[PDB]
Amino acid sequence: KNSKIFSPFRIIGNVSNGVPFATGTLGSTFYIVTCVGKTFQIYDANTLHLLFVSEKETPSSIVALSAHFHYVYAAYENKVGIYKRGIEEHLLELETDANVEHLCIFGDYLCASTDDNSIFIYKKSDPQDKYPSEFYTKLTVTEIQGGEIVSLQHLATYLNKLTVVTKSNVLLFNVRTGKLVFTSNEFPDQITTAEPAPVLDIIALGTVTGEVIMFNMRKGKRIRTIKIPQSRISSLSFRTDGSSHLSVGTSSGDLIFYDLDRRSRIHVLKNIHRESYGGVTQATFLNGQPIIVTSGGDNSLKEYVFDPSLSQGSGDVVVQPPRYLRSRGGHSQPPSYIAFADSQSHFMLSASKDRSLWSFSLRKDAQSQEMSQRLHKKQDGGRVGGSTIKSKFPEIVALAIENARIGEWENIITAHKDEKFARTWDMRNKRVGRWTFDTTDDGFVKSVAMSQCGNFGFIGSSNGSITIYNMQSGILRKKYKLHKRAVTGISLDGMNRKMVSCGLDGIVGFYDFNKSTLLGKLKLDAPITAMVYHRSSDLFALALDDLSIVVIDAVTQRVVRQLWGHSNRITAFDFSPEGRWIVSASLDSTIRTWDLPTGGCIDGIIVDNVATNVKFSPNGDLLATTHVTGNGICIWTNRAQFKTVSTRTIDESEFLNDIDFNTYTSLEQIDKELLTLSIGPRSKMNTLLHLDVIRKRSKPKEAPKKSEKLPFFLQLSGGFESHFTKQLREGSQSKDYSSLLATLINFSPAAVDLEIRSLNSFEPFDEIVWFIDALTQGLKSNKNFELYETFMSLLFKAHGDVIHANNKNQDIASALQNWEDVHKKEDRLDDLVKFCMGVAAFVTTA
Amino acid sequence: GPYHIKYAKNGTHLLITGRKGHVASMDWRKGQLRAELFLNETCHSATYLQNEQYFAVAQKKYTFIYDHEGTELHRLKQHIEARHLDFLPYHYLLVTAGETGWLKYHDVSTGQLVSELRTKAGPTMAMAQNPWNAVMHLGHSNGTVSLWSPSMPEPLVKLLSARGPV
Amino acid sequence: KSDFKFSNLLGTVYRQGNITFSDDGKQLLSPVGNRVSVFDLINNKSFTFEYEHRKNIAAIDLNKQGTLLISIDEDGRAILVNFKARNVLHHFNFKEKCSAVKFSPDGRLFALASGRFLQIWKTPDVNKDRQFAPFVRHRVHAGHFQDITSLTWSQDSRFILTTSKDLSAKIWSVDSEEKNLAATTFNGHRDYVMGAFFSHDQEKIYTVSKDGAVFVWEFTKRKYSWRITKKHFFYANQAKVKCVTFHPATRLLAVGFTSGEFRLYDLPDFTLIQQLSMGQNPVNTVSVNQTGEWLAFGSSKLGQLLVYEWQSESYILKQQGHFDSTNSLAYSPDGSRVVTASEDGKIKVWDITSGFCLATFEEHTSSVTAVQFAKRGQVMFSSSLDGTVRAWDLIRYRNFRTFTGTERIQFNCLAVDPSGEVVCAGSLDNFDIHVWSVQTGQLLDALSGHEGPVSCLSFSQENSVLASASWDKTIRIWSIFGRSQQVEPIEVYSDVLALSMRPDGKEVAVSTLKGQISIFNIEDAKQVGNIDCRKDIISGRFNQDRFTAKNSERSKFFTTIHYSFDGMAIVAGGNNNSICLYDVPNEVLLKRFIVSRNMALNGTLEFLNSKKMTEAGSLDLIDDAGENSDLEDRIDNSLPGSQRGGDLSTRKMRPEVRVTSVQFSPTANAFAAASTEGLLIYSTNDTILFDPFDLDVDVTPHSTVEALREKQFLNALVMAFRLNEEYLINKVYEAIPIKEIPLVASNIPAIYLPRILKFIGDFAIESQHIEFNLIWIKALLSASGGYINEHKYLFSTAMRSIQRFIVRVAKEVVNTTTDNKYTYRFLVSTDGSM
Amino acid sequence: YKLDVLSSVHFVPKPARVETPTISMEDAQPLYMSNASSLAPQEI
Amino acid sequence: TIQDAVKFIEQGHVRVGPNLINDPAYLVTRNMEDYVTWVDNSKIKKTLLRYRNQIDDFDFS
RNA sequence: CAUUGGUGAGCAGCGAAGGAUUUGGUGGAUUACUAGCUAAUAGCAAUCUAUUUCAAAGAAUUCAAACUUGGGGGAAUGCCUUGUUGA
């Protein structure tokens, strides 16, 4: 269940999963931590801005969250994790095999309640410690003491006491000594929720039949009972602004505000969250604020605020209803379709089965916005029609987006489930556009496509017709009638010349678009379900019913690759931006990465949930997948951005080196008789030849203002024989100069100037003779040719007078004779160069 | 922001001055706005003149004098890069100090510049007036407070107050 | 063909910020706008990073391993970049403006000076994969009262020295256990402390101030504490210390001043090693490499970079860039050099491989408006607003002839005939086209017949017919050679702004004011094509505009266009934020390039953040220069209504994004654009894409290598061309033996032969296999010279690249060899006795 | 200069052969492009 | 009026040659007077052409 | 006859427990996500201030200091500079 190419990065589009969020305070700032599957997310409350994300996914889902003063406690299976800034500082694994249900942090103690009615108390080793870390004790709540534990709360000023709310009664424990201090009388109804009031000794209990009971723990009694009939109470909260208001959140999705002083009902907010996902799972009044933060299982997090009263004298009697302040949201159902909205990988478009089309930002979660489905006025002036009770569009099954004309007119086409027309959308305004494109043959829209110019949109119909519309004016331009079964793919090339269609009849049709002719047909063995076209390489891949992927070259109309290995229906596939890879997800819970040059399966991933959509970023840095379960998009990073991956096939285990890594190192020398240059820079020869005048250019024009007395050996403060000359002598002795030539190559140009210029210019000229012999052997080597020529040129510049005045010496004359013998063979390079210039110049100009 | 504030000697009017050119004169107790200017320029200080009817603003280079409604009456070319403004209410003298290290006294009734004094100590870090005898106490970056009178070209008293800038 | 990637930013060496050497000392990293350029000074290889900040870069740092680059712009936004992979790992937002970034000498931590605070973060592992938040905060230290000017790590990573504007420097410890060793504030300075440095061992501390004082602190007795042992002063009175760096092993202190002066001192002796002047503008940054031989000074105004060897008083590098100042570019006929004309009157020759300027010509006394080359590469012509057209030999660097009309008129466009006898120029002051001879400097003619200013000129490279076009909505085609002297006009709907000739010379393309590019035939004046380019253009909204970018008509046209050398594509640019590439037979847009992403430029955003708009207006238009610390920063020297400003008079409004000249390279698949930031070089590399040609199921790299092992060399080469992969083509090409080269080169199919020519041209200039490449070129020229001769324009780029290989390296090798041979012949044949 | 700054369409610059190698006439950088000395043979 | 001209300049109606000028402080030379004209697609230009009954929508007016 | 004139009276067509214009307010986005405060290696967030003070360190132009002025003529008295007189 791992890949060599793709690594998990994040899952976007998710806000909360219906686990009751925890609120935390830092100074005057509030934050909300919501649960998102196995991670948690922290939001700044004042802006609902994402601050932190849990760094690593937990092995299991998070079941409870708590927050206090920079620290977040998250419960999953038998463990409780203690995190600061998303990073896990500590982990507590309870000795039980049971699962942690509830958490309560107060003072030194962390109390963790499991599903077998056991409470594990942990305490700090030293009261200066930031969090509890070591095990203190375990308390069992037997069935005679009370039912199953509903909550662990801690009332204020209750020294070392924990309030355990069960379905039957309320217990009080001394967590230092382990004693059971108090046990209340049994309540007739099952208690579902509990919340400590901001008054002394009072805890609020919400029951299944709809009762909110104020319980006095010190008196041991009930002081008030509020009845909300035919409602299951899911959340309770108290206002601390100075107004005695109580908020009750029901599982039907309603939020009810009561005035406790006035004994009245202020307001009811109906269906703020969906009943099916659990209604109002959590609603918390912020401390001292007229702001209540609500959430539910439908991937929403909202805020409501109370305005000040319109009456000056009356005030508390005349209360305005709570109003919507701000929210974050996502899909309530898994996404049906995804696409990338631009080349910068800033934004993604995602349509889900809850009939919503959203735009999700990969850079900042605040920029995510739902595309508006508010219709436009018809151009003729007639009424649109449809039901006045407005519902969303049917779920989108196909989408095409082209940003060539963004801001001018519509640039998105969507095909919706079981409809005979396609819809257009504008991405600049983020709203539905004014044209609906029909199939004109009484068939459902199976395919959509768009031109790269942005002027044309294409519809594939379930009856075989292809209609071409104008995206600017919504006017039907043309209709192509080749197919007889459903058209399951259309595309057009980047030059708008050739158009390709594929359908369930097994036919690939190649059309010309400028002239309306048909260029060809191709019959394949199986019906074709989907097509992806790559416009830089003119290559399109087709998914077939025989569980294969067929890559066809469009210019030559030929099947060039065929990919086998998926053991069930190919749900999705996409090209890499350079066209080298195809990533395909199938119904066999595998995502395979295919190399097209080799036609091989280089990578595979065994996924836990079937990936319905796979798209790949135009930057090539990201991969986006959507799965059957989960309301978010999984973002994957491409390891090939930062490292190189072998194209060796990976289908052997489950599911030479130059070819594997798509590289080739040029040889040092192709043949012994071929003249080759040095491996270094080309300018080394020129610098070595004209280094002195480069010096004289590089010197400053005026003498710099120095000190009156400069200390000697300032650079030093900041043997008998050189290694060069030792190598020269031993090379003369052993008649092999290879190491000498190697160190001459690796010397810097100024070092070359020193070691050539400072040779023994006197009798018997042994150093000059040995250097000439070394250069002759280097010329025999046929490598570093220009460097050895430069060395001889530098020798002629430095010691030319010695050689000239001392020629007809036997040793010098014989050395230069050997040099001329080896050097006269190199006139072939002159002939090659002269032929190349003469012929190339004649061919070019004449 | 940020805002440098000044009160009238009665205390019935308040003159705020933002660094980004938002200068307002108001009757703060009444809640009545006399003037509001958006100069779109760097402004450092403002002061009232003998009434709330006139006020001086030390803008980016020159110091400007505005009336009650907010019309520009004067642009004082002689007062250059003043960061500190003051008014001597019995002498009708507007005193400017700033980045140039020159203390300038200008008569607001006649319009004649009374004194240009060369502090010779770099830009003036601080400035206060002695309300008892109308002597200006300037604070320089060398750590000395100097006491100035318009009739004398050199300071009356030099006090070594701090080590660093005052 | 259509694929182009941003390769280089040429013509700029330093904008503002920190410049850093690499640890090996070979590469210099400098910030150029919102981009970082790396120059390899040993291999002479320059590149720039593709990523952009949204504003100008304020600080950079490179890891000692050379694997990580952190670059922070103004307003504190960081980008962490994999250096060797050349890809962005992460984006961070430090909410406060950051003065300095520095990695630890270990590289495990990095310190950041943001405001009063010093933030130490742990550096992410480069071998780890990208994660949502890779930065773990180590600590935040908040002892300084005002903004931190600089920070310095110790040679062991235990301690950090921070210097701030509150006239002090603090010492901080990374370990809480070692915080007792580092609790000292160093005081006594009379101005901003510019740097605090340790000695080569930990026991001495040097602190440098803005007013020019160096303090030596030692831990000595009067128990034991730090105290100022010795105070040294730079007695530069007017100049203030702008920057300072210290190399502790060499004990070298390098100081840069506001007067343009830099001093080298030896510490603790305070011995003045050296004292020089970059110019008149302040020295904004100083760096020193690790071994200490090389210093690097950067000045923001005029964009000056200077690498100085100091033990030998020698300039490794002395460069000056041009920002918002380039009017025209011309490629050399081999694509190795680009020559730019500038508004300050300079003509500069920039090498492309190394991003440095080769020569600068300063004879023009006003803004130079056009630069062209002859067909011979040795002559270029330049037209300027000063009233002169000058001719330059690039062999002697000699302005060998100047060309002047009767009166002084402002020349704006320039053309030269192919056989370099006739030079034409057009002006906005006059409606005539002035025609001079080259051999004799006298003017032959003044062509009349345009009712507006001649906006554009070109000579047909084969017919030698002159096409001009003007703001009178006409294109006049003049046959100035021959006895006839006939002109034919063509009427266009709108004002002609740009013109280009097809390399065939049969057609002329014209960019007009209405956003169209119309293509006309010359032999018969018939419009053979039209491209509607108006909607493709990305036009931003300025901060002073009271009208929408949609309704703005400032830049809805193209002011420069150029043909590809095969004649199939046109690149176009203008005063907009888009560079558009078109395919002329299909009249369609291939690709569009965003010129800049810099919010410091003006027209880069179509929409502006409405939080900026107040009841006063934009917050970006408030004159906030009065808040600056220095009088030189506070002074407003501007003249009202100046469109561009001057050297002494800087304009109030921000620079605008614009492209003044686009051209295609004669040698490679690349194009250059002269834009505000510099020269945008966009190139194509074939190693990236997978673009098969005539692919088949049998054709795989394994099958190609198998045919190579079976020694079917022609089949292997053809299969490698069909796969179109550079590594596989290289493998087969180097595996073919020398004896087989004539047969394979004779039997190469005619379709794949442009591919082998382009491959050899690209490969042979860097490769060491000079004789092998020459044998291949000789075999291909012998086999198919006639085919190339028929298809000139299909082969022109490949043939020019091959000629560049033959002239640029092979002749230098041959010249050195022949000089050696003749010198040997003299030294042996002639007697040198007595 | 100031009048040219007022009226000039472009940026206004501020107002300002012995025998030598051309490699000396170049700018300071590792490379060179032209070798021959400045003086022509007819000028020598 | 000059104030009307100021507003028309800031509202994007004026070009001096091909170049739009939205700066009122821009100084016009005697030579540069001959190219101070209305921008195309200007409602002002359409209004004056429509007044003279000489509006050609092919030219965009 | 034309009306690319105004003001109206009516049809066909469109058409789901309405439709069409106009407008005030608030929220999100308009750059790329690492949480509040402080005296900051920590503490606070219900603050403390009844340890908040000692010690140590810390004083160059030997005040260098309008790079800051619309043009032409001046300067009684100021101011600046230089010289001088008497202490």
From Swiss-Prot, chain A:
Gene3D superfamilies to which the protein is assigned, alphabetical: YVTN repeat-like/Quinoprotein amine dehydrogenase
Nucleus listed as a keyword: yes
UniProt xrefs under InterPro entries: Quinoprotein_ADH-like_sf (IPR011047), SSU_processome_Utp21 (IPR007319), WD40/YVTN_repeat-like_dom_sf (IPR015943), WD40_repeat_CS (IPR019775), WD40_repeat_dom_sf (IPR036322), WD40_rpt (IPR001680)
Principal location class: nucleus
Subcellular location: Nucleus, Nucleolus
One GO term (biological process): maturation of SSU-rRNA
SMART domains: WD40
Pfam families named in the record: Beta-prop_WDR36-Utp21_1st, Beta-prop_WDR36-Utp21_2nd, Utp21
GO cellular component: 90S preribosome; nucleolus; nucleoplasm; nucleus; Pwp2p-containing subcomplex of 90S preribosome; small-subunit processome
Keywords per UniProt: Acetylation, Nucleus, Phosphoprotein, Repeat, Ribonucleoprotein, Ribosome biogenesis, rRNA processing, WD repeat
Swiss-Prot/TrEMBL WD repeat ranges: 22-53, 63-93, 101-140, 150-183, 190-227, 234-269, 277-329, 336-370, 397-436, 445-479, 487-523, 528-563, 565-606, 608-646
Repeat is among the record's keywords: yes
Additional record remark: Present with 2020 molecules/cell in log phase SD medium.
Subunit structure, interactors included: Interacts with snoRNA U3. Interacts with MPP10. Interacts (via WD repeats) with UTP18. Component of the ribosomal small subunit (SSU) processome composed of at least 40 protein subunits and snoRNA U3.
Biological role: Involved in nucleolar processing of pre-18S ribosomal RNA and ribosome assembly.
Domain notes: The WD repeats are grouped into two tandem seven-bladed beta-propeller regions.
Protein name: U3 small nucleolar RNA-associated protein 21
Species lineage: Eukaryota, Fungi, Dikarya, Ascomycota, Saccharomycotina
Swiss-Prot record, chain B:
Biological process, per Gene Ontology: endonucleolytic cleavage in 5'-ETS of tricistronic rRNA transcript (SSU-rRNA, 5.8S rRNA, LSU-rRNA); endonucleolytic cleavage in ITS1 to separate SSU-rRNA from 5.8S rRNA and LSU-rRNA from tricistronic rRNA transcript (SSU-rRNA, 5.8S rRNA, LSU-rRNA); endonucleolytic cleavage to generate mature 5'-end of SSU-rRNA from (SSU-rRNA, 5.8S rRNA, LSU-rRNA); maturation of SSU-rRNA; maturation of SSU-rRNA from tricistronic rRNA transcript (SSU-rRNA, 5.8S rRNA, LSU-rRNA)
Highest taxon above the source species: Eukaryota
Assigned keywords, A-Z: Nucleus, Repeat, Ribonucleoprotein, Ribosome biogenesis, rRNA processing, WD repeat
GO cellular component terms attached to this protein's record: 90S preribosome; nucleolus; nucleoplasm; preribosome, small subunit precursor; small-subunit processome
Localization terms from the record: Nucleus, Nucleolus
WD repeats: 1-38, 119-158
Role of this protein: Involved in nucleolar processing of pre-18S ribosomal RNA.
Subunit structure: Interacts with snoRNA U3. Interacts with MPP10. Component of the ribosomal small subunit (SSU) processome composed of at least 40 protein subunits and snoRNA U3.
Something else known: Present with 5800 molecules/cell in log phase SD medium.
Record protein name field: U3 small nucleolar RNA-associated protein 7
Native organism: Saccharomyces cerevisiae (strain ATCC 204508 / S288c)
Organism lineage: Eukaryota, Fungi, Dikarya, Ascomycota, Saccharomycotina
Shown residues in whole-protein numbering: 112 to 277 of 554
From Swiss-Prot, chain D:
Role: Involved in nucleolar processing of pre-18S ribosomal RNA. Required for the early cleavages at sites A0, A1 and A2 during 18S ribosomal pre-RNA processing.
Parent-record interval covered: 446 to 495 of 593
Localization, UniProt: Nucleus, Nucleolus
Name of the protein in its database record: U3 small nucleolar RNA-associated protein MPP10
Signal peptide: none
Family label: Belongs to the MPP10 family.
Quaternary context: Component of a heterotrimeric complex containing IMP3, IMP4 and MPP10. Interacts with snoRNA U3. Component of the ribosomal small subunit (SSU) processome composed of at least 40 protein subunits and snoRNA U3. Interacts with the SSU processome subunits EMG1, IMP3, IMP4, KRR1, NOC4/UTP19, NOP1, RPS4A, RPS4B, RPS6A, RPS6B, RPS7A, RPS7B, RPS9A, RPS9B, RPS14A, RPS14B, UTP1-UTP18, UTP20-UTP22 and UTP25.
From Swiss-Prot, chain E:
GO cellular component, one term: small-subunit processome
Protein name: U3 small nucleolar ribonucleoprotein protein IMP3
Top-level division of the source organism's lineage: Eukaryota
Stretch forming the signal peptide: none
Keywords in alphabetical order: Nucleus, Ribonucleoprotein, Ribosome biogenesis, RNA-binding, rRNA processing, rRNA-binding
UniProt source species: Saccharomyces cerevisiae (strain ATCC 204508 / S288c) (Baker's yeast)
Residues of the full protein shown: 123 to 183 of 183
Function in brief: Required for the early cleavages at sites A0, A1 and A2 during 18S ribosomal pre-RNA processing.
Coiled coil: none
GO molecular function per UniProt: RNA folding chaperone; rRNA binding; snoRNA binding
